[PDB]
Write a protein that binds this ligand. Structure first.
Ligand code: ADP
Lengths: 19, 97, 47, 108
């Protein structure tokens, strides 16, 4: 569960950076 | 302190053994019945053995069990001689321990 | 005879142990796929 | 396993250690002359050699005191009675009249 949460956060940070 | 008054010898199921039982009672249970304070003052220990022998089938196990019963105590732990021995080193004496 | 025999002793493992590829250490396959996904996403983020 | 604590405490506190005592009872039951007892699996000899090697070996101890009681001193092994292993040997015998008087005095 921790790794999936980390992956989700990284995808979100990619999103913020894509903006 | 752990015995009742209403019994002499034959109120339980053993007949014909009178002198022997008086001797046994006097020597064995004459220090477990009195108040502990008195026996402590006298400064004496308790008997830790009893060997009663005779012809087979004469009422030895019966008297043993009755002695056990009349003084409260837990269930007797029974064993017979030749069952102790084994054929591994240190097992013939572990059972006696 | 009496007390004329000694003995050795052998040992069996546990059934729960069973195989060596039993997940939590062998499922490092699936987890590795998760970690590779993580690595790819981090590569993009760092870029 | 009877000597472990003594060794452990000696290795740390050299000459300030407390005294350790172990009592062997009926010493003659197992520690008979090695090589003379009847044939078997060979456990008596191993026991005797182990005790011999532990009592006085290449690693020194200065904390232990061991006491032994027996009724037949003749059966004990010969090497256990060497000085340094069982050095002081004493004999207790039936008392004489004054001894009986003293025993009576201290019992009652
Ligand atoms: N004095 C007795 N009074 C009543 N029953 C007796 C007496 N002596 C023996 N028995 C009978 O014998 C049996 C007791 O076994 P016991 O004789 O003590 O075995 P052993 O004497 O071989 O140890 C019981 O059936 C018991 O009723």
């Amino acid at each position: 569960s921790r790794t999936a949460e980390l992956q989700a956060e990284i995808d979100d940070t990619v999103g913020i950076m894509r903006d | 302190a752990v015995i009742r008054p209403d019994f002499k010898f034959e109120d339980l199921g053993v007949g014909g053994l009178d002198k022997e039982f008086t001797k046994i009672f006097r020597r064995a249970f004459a220090s477990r019945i009195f108040p502990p304070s008195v026996i402590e003052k006298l400064g004496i220990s308790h008997v830790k053995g009893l060997l009663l022998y005779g012809p087979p089938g004469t009422g030895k196990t019966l008297i043993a069990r009755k002695i056990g019963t009349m003084l409260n105590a837990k269930e007797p732990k029974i064993v017979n001689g030749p069952e102790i021995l084994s054929k591994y080193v240190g097992s013939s004496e572990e059972n006696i321990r | 005879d009496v007390g004329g025999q000694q003995i050795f002793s052998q040992a069996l493992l546990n059934a729960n142990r069973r195989g060596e590829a039993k997940t939590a250490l062998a499922e490092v396959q699936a987890r590795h796929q998760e970690l590779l996904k993580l690595e790819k996403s981090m590569a993009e983020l760092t870029q | 396993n009877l000597f472990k604590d003594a060794e452990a405490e000696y290795r740390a506190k050299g000459e300030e250690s407390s005294l350790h005592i172990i009592i062997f009872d009926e010493l003659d039951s197992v520690f008979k002359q090695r090589g003379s007892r009847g044939d078997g699996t060979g456990v008596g000899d191993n026991v005797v050699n182990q005790l011999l090697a532990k009592m006085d070996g290449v690693d020194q101890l200065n904390n232990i005191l061991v006491i032994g009681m027996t009724n037949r001193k003749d059966l004990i092994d010969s090497a256990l009675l060497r000085p340094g292993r069982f050095e002081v040997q004493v004999e207790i015998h039936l008392p004489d009249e004054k001894g009986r008087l003293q025993i009576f005095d201290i019992q009652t």
